[PDB]
Each structure stands twice: as C-alpha cells, then as structure tokens.
Design a protein around this nucleic acid. Sequence first.
RNA 1: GACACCUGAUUC
DNA 2: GAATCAGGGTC
Lengths: 48, 48, 48
Amino acid sequence: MFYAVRRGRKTGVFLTWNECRAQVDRFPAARFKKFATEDEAWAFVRKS
Amino acid sequence: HMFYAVRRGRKTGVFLTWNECRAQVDRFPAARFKKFATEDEAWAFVRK
Amino acid sequence: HMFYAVRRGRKTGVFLTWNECRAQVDRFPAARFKKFATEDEAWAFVRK
RNA sequence: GACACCUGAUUC
DNA sequence: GAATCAGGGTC
Ligand SMILES: [Mg+2]
Ligand SMILES: [Mg+2]
C-alpha cells in the first residue's frame, strides 16, 4: 500500500505505516490515507 | 452507503458525507450525530 | 458493547449501557468511571 | 479491539 | 491543563 500524508510533519507518499505514522501521530488534525497505487497516494497529497 | 444522522446540530437530518455532517456538529454544544449504513436507520436516529 | 464500571457516582456497580452509566456520573462531583472488556475487570475498578 | 487526532458533554 | 465517556485516519 502507499501511504499518503497530505498534512503532517513531513508530507509525501511513504511505503510503510511505520514511516507514515512518524508524520501524523500526535500531530493535530493530520490528514493521511493509504492507497493501492502510487498515483492515488500522490493525487491525495496534491489535493492540498 | 454512508448516512450521517444529525439529531442535534446546526441542521438536523441525514447527510451523505462526513464533511457535510461535520459542518453541522463541529463546535456545536451537545451535538448529537451518528453514522449509519442505511438511510432508514439514519432517519430513526433523527426522528426518535 | 463493554462493561461500564462506576466507582463513584449516584449508584455504583457495573452497567451495560452508556445511558445507565451516564445517569450515574453526569454532573456528579468527583465521579469515577471507566469501560472494561469484562465484568471482572469492571468490578475490579469499582472496588479500588 | 487498539492507536492517533477532531469535536462535544461532564468532572477535577 | 487532565481524566472519563459520547460521535467522527491507521493497526
Ligand atoms: Mg517511505
Ligand atoms: Mg448532504
């Protein structure tokens, strides 16, 4: 799966929940979502 | 299949997306809302 | 659907619904309650 | 079920 | 500020 963080410490797409969570855990109002394709993860990122 | 029943909020009723329901219950005192899988169940919550 | 343990409240004990638990702790000074997976854990909290 | 976070109620 | 509960991305 591809982890999209559109809002967090460090935005971008990540390949693991482990790295994804470092950006969003304890970060107020973090916006993230996992996807099956890189293309979708990136679309999410760019929607802000 | 996402139905958000707003029993207590800016506007009461059933909504199809969380963003919609959120705008009626966020920062609203004693807001009462719940998400259901079927429109029917959402109305019950709203009319009870 | 868990077990609501009320250590301090109008009536203490273990309740099965938030409503019943709520009726005992809401606006009760110094109310102490928590939900547990089992009844045993719950009655454990009631006696501390 | 758990974790994080948002909002609300109550209590301290 | 904190806790408990209620309603609403990830594991
Ligand atoms: Mg990565
Ligand atoms: Mg709508």
